[PDB]
Design a protein around this ligand. Structure first.
Ligand SMILES: [Zn+2]
Ligand SMILES: [Zn+2]
Ligand SMILES: [Zn+2]
Ligand SMILES: [Zn+2]
Ligand SMILES: [Zn+2]
Ligand SMILES: [Zn+2]
Lengths: 86, 87
DNA sequence: ATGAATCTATTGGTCAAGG
DNA sequence: CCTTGACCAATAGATTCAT
């Protein structure tokens, strides 16, 4: 089948459905811990790795108690989302 | 009473043969084993499909340098090399 | 450094036409 | 009834940006 916007045609209709999301902006797969959403379930699994993998220490946000695997990520979360509280 | 219902989940089928393949997702049975790798599936035509990743009627075939496993897609061969041959 | 976005090849489960 | 291949979502990994 053919792409509406790009016009790029691929042998895979499943991949085209994902590609059309980039034009449409649809993000069906929503994270259960934050506002993040994406067009591919695999990419959401990758995102979920940043909320704390089992077996490693997990840092929670001081304000909203959101889990993060990496401390620098939690710092970026603070600046992006809790700047209004300073 | 026609053996159209899954004993594990209760799904009903209009084709009893579909129940036979479906049930293997509950039992883990995978009778169709690929002869060119360790792949194994529960549906005959799925193994037929997977074998297309090993080669075509003509086209070109890339074989792993170490284990001589054939591939039709080079990127797949690269993933195989990293997965099995890190030495 | 950490992670999202893009890309694509392969796979699981479904289903029913037709053999 | 069984075989078979199309269909769609899911998966896994690689590359390419963004911050
Ligand atoms: Zn497009
Ligand atoms: Zn999240
Ligand atoms: Zn927070
Ligand atoms: Zn079942
Ligand atoms: Zn194989
Ligand atoms: Zn090999």
């Amino acid at each position: 089948d053919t792409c509406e916007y790009c016009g790029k045609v691929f042998k895979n209709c499943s991949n085209l459905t994902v590609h059309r999301r980039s034009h449409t902006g649809e993000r069906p797969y929503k994270c259960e811990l934050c506002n993040y959403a994406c067009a591919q379930s695999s990419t959401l699994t990758r995102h979920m790795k940043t909320h704390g993998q089992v077996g490693k220490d997990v840092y929670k946000c001081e304000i909203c108690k959101m889990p993060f695997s990496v401390y620098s990520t939690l710092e970026k979360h603070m600046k992006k989302w809790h700047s209004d509280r300073v």
